[PDB]
Amino acid sequence: GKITFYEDRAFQGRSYETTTDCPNLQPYFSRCNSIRVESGCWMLYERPNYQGQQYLLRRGEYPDYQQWMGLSDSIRSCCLIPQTVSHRLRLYEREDHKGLMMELSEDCPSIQDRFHLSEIRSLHVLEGCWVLYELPNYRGRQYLLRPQEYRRCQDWGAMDAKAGSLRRVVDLY
Template sequence: MLPSIAVAASPWCPRCSGKASASPATALSVAAITSLRTPLLLDDGTVMTSMESADDAEDPKEDAPEPRRQIIFYEDRNFQGRSHESSSDCSELNSYFSRCNSIRVENGNWMIYERPNYTGQQYFVKRGEYPDCQHWSGLSDSIRSCRLIPQHHGSFRIRIYEREDFRGQVMEFTEDCPHVNEEFNYHDIHSCNVLEGHWIFFEQPNYRGRQYYLKTGEYRRFTDWGAMNARVGSFRRISDLY
């Protein structure tokens, strides 16, 4: 609703229709009022302040830029020694450092790998500080590749199968599962289909042991997610936002 605006009216005249009329100097259309940008002094001393047009009010604001994803590797413990920063996937880290004993994640969710080309032991790290390899459950100081996990804002769905090639008993999950055997009645998962989101398989219950990153897609056998056997004790969603 537009604010009321005082305008100076002409004196009443018997020869007119009996209605007061606005003088030409103060007769303003609605369009002129809504497009006004600077204060205006009317004949009767009233000051009209600037107003924002409807077009300006409806203009969408530009999306704020997303924060930069960054992970920093250090050769020595407690963030000492030579370091290397990465902001995207890297299949070969050998040329940047010879060992890794501490990590600082400035932003993002990452999988780090014991060997080049995203192979070997896998470890999930998120924003935070890891002063030694035990803080990411590492077994050695060898980190040779890293992968940035895309952020997922939607729902999560995964189907697990008793046998390879999506055969045998099947169950669908939308939440974390700390004990696969209790829910699925099997200790092993031989194939799976990740329908939505990003997940991590753990070799042991309660999210312990070897880790395996799974993005959306089909996994016809356990070797497709980098495992040496079909044992999966638990799994969880990667739902950490950044």
């Protein structure tokens, strides 16, 4: 998909567009107080090199940042995620893929209500792309889960192991 960024509200200020990833948005802009995801699902980042708080911007026109109830203006990196035909994830109680393992192929609205874990140490996305969320109801700090074996929370750029909910990435056209 494709996206456009605006540092000021009402689709105003510093305007930049991309159709691919960009780990360093610094020479372009530092923030985005209004944003138009033309298509796709884009994992925005607070900090460059894919660090800090992550932000799932879905396909739509957001006339300001509070429209999707975001955390902070800080948009200093971006990731494009394509369509994924299937989804299979494994939640591990301990890091380095140990302890209680639990597979998941569905959208979990709240892991604490389901498998009673509010924090996950390590993951293994067998196939597809997922997104971990800090809070249930798909809220809080987002965390892009990519098709691989996550050794620990440090892998996907999590400063902590918090896991409120889980959802499977689908491409919105």
